[PDB]
Design a binder for this molecule. Structure first.
Ligand SMILES: NC(=O)C1=CN([C@@H]2O[C@H](COP(=O)(O)OP(=O)(O)OC[C@H]3O[C@@H](n4cnc5c(N)ncnc54)[C@H](OP(=O)(O)O)[C@@H]3O)[C@@H](O)[C@H]2O)C=CC1
Ligand SMILES: NC(=O)C1=CN([C@@H]2O[C@H](COP(=O)(O)OP(=O)(O)OC[C@H]3O[C@@H](n4cnc5c(N)ncnc54)[C@H](OP(=O)(O)O)[C@@H]3O)[C@@H](O)[C@H]2O)C=CC1
Ligand SMILES: CCC(=O)[C@@H](C)C(=O)SCCNC(=O)CCNC(=O)[C@H](O)C(C)(C)CO
Ligand SMILES: CCC(=O)[C@@H](C)C(=O)SCCNC(=O)CCNC(=O)[C@H](O)C(C)(C)CO
Lengths: 477, 477
């Protein structure tokens, strides 16, 4: 029990100091998405930054054009104190890349083009409702949430020219304005912040509360349960667990379906346990196929739970290199699939709606910006669903042993050297069960060697995020 | 900052497993204080334990009489599963020992007499409002809180016949009753518990969160500040610090007053810093002298803060030996003095009301039951005051270097061997300033060698209290 407790961490938000009252001495550069600069918070922030602030309208998604334009701006206007991006407001999906929110595409390209141009002023990315900071806070935009996953990775890959992320409240009044312009003057080493009516909060990682035997909350597993990526490594083990725990009917999907490696053996394993098994070949981002799958479910085994395990991590790239095509392919199974699952089951009163995220989204991982963004959407969607009165749980895995992506010895070796150790499947699944029995909204379930991880993580830049993990503080002291 | 952060720990409460639904198999022995058995919670608990439970009425405070009565009960009634003491309900002060709550005296004598008689069943001590467990919880009886200090020391000295402490909610309904009788059946290795509407909570020690720079909310030090025991080791250094921070007037008390060792030198030191100095000889348990002291404060320098450093630790004794006279003498400067300070200043809108407690109260110290009880009252009074809308901060010191009680080489050497290391005064006082800038209600400020402390503390019996200190868990693995 306590060994599985030790795997579970959550994100919390702690109150930090009120900022100072002077605006930055040097000039700001504000970056605006010209089709998506009407939102009240975008107006309010532009007003806060004041008329001396240089505006750059980021048109389209043209890296080379922006790099040239930013190079000219630097030449003409000189050096800036910071760059303040309002690109998050662009939530609409990119015309050519249907799983990529325009504001996410534009933020990637902005980070690239700033590098290209030699504009080194720290980049701050603003969002409105991209995080749930505080008890009772509503995460109203899970699309903007995805941007925090990307931003953390820009912090790891370009630490010297990264400012951070700030979430604005719903009403940016003079108190909020002053807190923003104060933070831009000096943020006291914080870089993941939320401005709220009550003050400024910052993001923290903490050990989760221990599991409570007799916890209640979780209904018995029964009826039909959909596992996307259910023929995959983690998905297969999850299916077996659900079969052990009394599911009537497991519906496993993946793009290869019944032709997936080892699907025949998985079906036999599950059917031995007395469970009906359906394996469908089905892109999780295909809305029509999902609708058709749901319409077919037995009347005596209604859908009770979704476990969304569909995902790829390959053909990512460093922030400086990543293409929008690569980004799209990483977002597809995550953002587009999870949005379809959310919309199509919202009326079904599920017992569980479980999304498989990653540490890459929770703390960040160099070389994995597209995977981080994709998985950070899932974490955000879960909070968002809770605000609607719907069940959701996002489980941000560390590293799995035995099955799944991380079983390549080269990947495994890199992960161990960063101190994210491989979990035994029974311990990982037991920790997940603890999470679902608590009915927690979001958790990271990971085996950390903090003595390896904290120094690696903070080599080039401090992390306020880890200040609430005593082992991390000890390792760094 | 981070060195002072490292000194600070907090008591928190985590939800634990729900117990089983069956009564203990064997018979219970309930111990009641016959003049103080009318409180609703005492009725509710008696009703919960059921009519098969043997009742023992603990009359007076006669160790030998009780030992003989318990010896006869054992002979006649046979062996018990546990002994459940309701003696805490007796809050009135002992007629012969004016600083000792009757229930505290009776609980000591019960623990003694059970040992005398050979009645070995684990002893559980129940309280109602003696701890503040959970957000928003009201510690309504700081007198009953004192019993927790004693109980932890009974756990250390008589580990094989100590059950633990359980705090009941204000309304002991059927759900609370079942949690009580379940814990008495089997408590899963827990022994400091609080039963609340939301579940069963257990007591934990944890690192405090690192201070957030720039974020203080402590008002300026100004006016008159009363330091009881202000001529003593810690108290003198505290006085100097308060002078540096802007106090207009330091009022230092102790029983010897101006005849205290070094008092002339301390007065001159403070006068150099530009403050008015009053050194008064008086017992801090003397209500009338405190009143007279407060009445004569300059009109230009009203009382703004109390720092309660008055205390003695000598002429304590093991639980098996401690007399009520010894207990009284250890309680006097803590319970009686702090009650007078609380009552006489409650209407003065103080900025600070700081009570100097001890690790001996927070985790417990073999050989120090009376000192532990006395200091545990202070920690409880602080919570209690907060529930009334009054300021309070209890700081449970570990070991001070350089000045004060622990500078006796023999005491110093014992403490180091237990892993409670001597703090430098500037680091201790700096950690106290962090606490007051956070406006925390209670904290322990201590330098621990956990590799020495954890094994010593747990040699005879596990401590769920330490399960939240990662260094302690590591030392024991
Ligand atoms: N392994 C680990 O340590 C960690 C895993 N995770 C997450 O856990 C989940 C499972 O990972 P894991 O089991 O290790 O990896 P696997 O590759 O073994 O499983 C991924 C599954 O998703 C399927 N899939 C991928 N794209 C799609 C899509 N568009 N539509 C439907 N199915 C798709 C794959 O099958 P097909 O190719 O046939 O579509 C495969 O069955 C992933 O979402 C991953 O991001 C996160 C953190 C760490
Ligand atoms: N030193 C340490 O490491 C720790 C200290 N503490 C607490 O800190 C406080 C200060 O300890 P420290 O400075 O080391 O010890 P000291 O003995 O140096 O100081 C204690 C002071 O309290 C005074 N005092 C004792 N009884 C009374 C009373 N009835 N009325 C008024 N004053 C009285 C003493 O003077 P007089 O005898 O003249 O009255 C003395 O000035 C104590 O309360 C102690 O319990 C707790 C944890 C550890
Ligand atoms: C392939 C299976 C899988 O999901 C893999 C990619 C993962 O689990 S990726 C996440 C593993 N690594 C991380 O989470 C650690 C990221 N942090 C690290 O400590 C890195 O060393 C730093 C220095 C920050 C540079 O990125
Ligand atoms: C005299 C000045 C003073 O306040 C001194 C006595 C103190 O600091 S007392 C508290 C010092 N010691 C402790 O707090 C550790 C007590 N715990 C210990 O670890 C003991 O070895 C055990 C094994 C539990 C038996 O009591």
């Amino acid at each position: 029990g306590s060994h599985m407790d030790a795997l579970r961490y959550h994100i919390e938000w702690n109150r930090v100091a009120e900022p100072g009252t002077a605006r930055p001495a040097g000039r700001l550069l504000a970056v605006i998405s010209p089709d998506h600069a009407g939102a009240p918070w975008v107006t309010a922030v532009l007003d806060a930054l004041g008329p001396d602030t240089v505006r750059f309208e980021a048109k389209g998604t043209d890296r080379a054009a922006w790099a040239a334009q930013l190079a000219q701006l630097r030449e003409d206007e000189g050096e800036f104190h910071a760059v303040v991006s309002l690109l998050a407001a662009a939530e609409a999906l990119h015309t050519d890349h249907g799983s990529v929110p325009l504001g996410l595409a534009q933020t990637l390209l902005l980070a690239q083009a700033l590098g290209d141009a030699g504009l080194t002023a720290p980049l701050w990315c603003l969002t409105r409702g991209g995080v749930a900071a505080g008890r009772g806070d509503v995460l109203s935009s899970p699309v903007q949430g995805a941007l925090w996953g990307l931003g953390r990775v820009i912090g790891l890959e370009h630490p010297d020219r990264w400012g951070g992320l700030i979430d604005l409240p719903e009403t940016v009044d003079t108190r909020a304005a002053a807190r923003l312009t104060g933070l831009l003057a000096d943020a006291g080493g914080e870089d993941q912040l939320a401005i709220r009516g009550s003050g400024v909060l910052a993001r923290r990682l903490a050990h989760a509360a221990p599991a409570v035997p007799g916890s209640g909350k979780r209904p018995p597993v029964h009826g039909s349960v959909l596992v996307t990526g259910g023929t995959g490594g983690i998905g297969g083990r999850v299916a077996r667990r659900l079969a052990e725990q009394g599911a009537a009917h497991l519906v496993l999907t993946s793009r290869r379906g019944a032709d997936a490696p080892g699907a025949a053996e998985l079906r036999a394993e599950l059917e031995q346990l007395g469970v009906r098994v359906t394996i469908a070949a089905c892109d999780a981002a295909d809305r029509e196929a999902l609708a058709a799958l749901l319409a077919e479910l037995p009347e005596d085994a209604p859908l009770t739970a979704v476990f969304h395990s569909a995902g790829v991590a390959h053909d990512d790239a460093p922030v400086a290199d990543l293409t929008l095509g690569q980004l799209d392919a990483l977002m597809r199974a995550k953002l587009t699939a999870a949005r379809h699952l959310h919309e199509l089951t919202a009326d079904l009163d599920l017992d569980a709606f479980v999304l498989f995220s990653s540490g890459a989204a929770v703390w960040g991982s160099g070389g994995q910006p597209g995977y981080a963004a994709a998985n950070a959407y899932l974490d955000a969607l879960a909070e968002h669903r809770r605000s609607l009165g719907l069940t959701a749980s996002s489980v941000a895995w560390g590293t799995w042993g035995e099955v799944g992506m991380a079983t390549d010895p080269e990947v495994h070796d890199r992960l161990v050297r960063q101190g994210v150790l491989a979990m035994e499947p029974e311990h990982a699944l037991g920790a997940l069960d603890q999470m679902l029995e608590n009915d927690d909204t979001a958790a990271a379930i990971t085996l950390m060697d903090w003595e390896m991880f904290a120094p690696a993580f903070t080599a080039n830049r401090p992390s306020a995020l880890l200040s609430t993990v005593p082992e991390a503080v000890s390792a760094l002291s």
